[PDB]
């Protein structure tokens, strides 16, 4: 009647707005919109900080590039937003924090391009390490890349330097980087950016954890995994490239246990 459509959306949070004209509806993970911590589930007793529009707004991470050789990308939350404006400051000044998110993945191309990205949001996205001599050895620094994220690989390559081990993840793409088959990742909240159909993915994520609130600096609640289910192609070019951009807004974030700021060892 007025022409409203699944494909055309506007999202506004704080001082930020996203528009899209080629959406494929949007997902609310497990049917649960983000929410503040109810009194009946509360646990730290101090009055929480709730930054509201100062932190619940769209932050855009560094753009990456999709090519025919890309195996996939991953990020962890809250880690990818640790250095984002007042969200990052509130996270590091407090022992505890919780937050939900709107995740908007952006990737446009043309009616002559093809390819499809699976965009998965995974609760507790534990990834496999690079070692066959020690388990659970990926270091804090390598497990937490911040906004640059990390990548998947098509080949497991064990680290053989036992003198100074690399201590990083070696996430194999068809094993979802965690020992399970990628074809089953669709039981996690997801969308697919299939270039002939849509140019974006939107996932609204509730805070998920076995606790009401926890250490954001120690623990990532969600992982975002983006893998090419169908490879990029274009006209008859051998090396096409198109960018992928992530923009993420925290939602209903609240924090407890205020003290001096955490200054983490990140390199």
């Amino acid at each position: 009647a007025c022409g409203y459509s699944d494909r055309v959306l506007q999202l506004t949070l704080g001082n930020s707005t996203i528009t899209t004209q080629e959406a494929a509806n949007s997902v609310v993970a497990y049917g649960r919109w983000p929410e503040y911590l109810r009194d009946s589930e509360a646990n730290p007793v101090d009055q929480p900080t709730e930054p509201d529009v100062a932190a619940c707004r769209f932050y855009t991470l560094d753009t990456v590039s999709w090519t025919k050789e890309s195996r996939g990308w991953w990020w962890k939350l809250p880690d990818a937003l640790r250095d984002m404006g007042l969200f990052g400051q509130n996270m590091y000044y407090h022992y505890l924090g919780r937050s939900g998110y709107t995740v908007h993945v952006q990737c446009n191309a043309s009616k002559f391009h093809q390819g499809a990205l699976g965009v998965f949001a995974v609760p507790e996205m534990c990834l496999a390490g690079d070692s066959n001599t020690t388990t659970m050895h990926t270091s804090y620094q390598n497990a937490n890349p911040g906004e640059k994220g990390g990548t998947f690989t098509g080949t497991f390559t064990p680290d053989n330097n036992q003198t100074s081990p690399a201590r990083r993840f070696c996430p194999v793409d068809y094993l979802l980087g965690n020992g399970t088959l990628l074809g089953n990742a669709f039981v996690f909240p997801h969308q697919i950016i299939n270039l002939r159909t849509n140019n974006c993915a939107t996932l609204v994520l509730p805070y998920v954890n076995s606790l009401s609130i926890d250490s954001m600096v120690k623990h990532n609640n969600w992982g975002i995994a983006i893998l090419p289910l169908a490879p990029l192609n274009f006209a008859s070019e051998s090396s096409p490239e198109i960018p992928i951009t992530l923009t993420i807004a925290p939602m209903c974030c609240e924090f407890n246990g205020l003290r001096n700021i955490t200054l983490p060892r990140l390199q």
């Binding site: 730290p44 246990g257 003290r259 001096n260």
Partner: protein
Amino acid sequence: FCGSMMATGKLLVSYAPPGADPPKKRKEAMLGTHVIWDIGLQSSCTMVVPWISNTTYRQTIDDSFTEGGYISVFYQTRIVVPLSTPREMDILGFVSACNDFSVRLLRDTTHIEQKA
């Protein structure tokens, strides 16, 4: 405070919930939970350590996942005494649980043993 009646002073008592550098300077301790104690006729001062924890219960052993944070005391101004007065004195500290405190999973203690 167990100094003489003529001694005065202000101290800062602090609780910093875990996850950051443990306070070694008043500047950092002052950013956490704290009470500034003015010494005077009410001899004593209480700081409440509010239950602030990620888990619903903590372990009764040293454990990082359920670590509780840092308690510290600093001089806020300084102890001042007139002449003919002891310039050094002691304070004594006490700990107790609040009415919201509980424990569970009964276990033996390492505080007693019987060898052979």
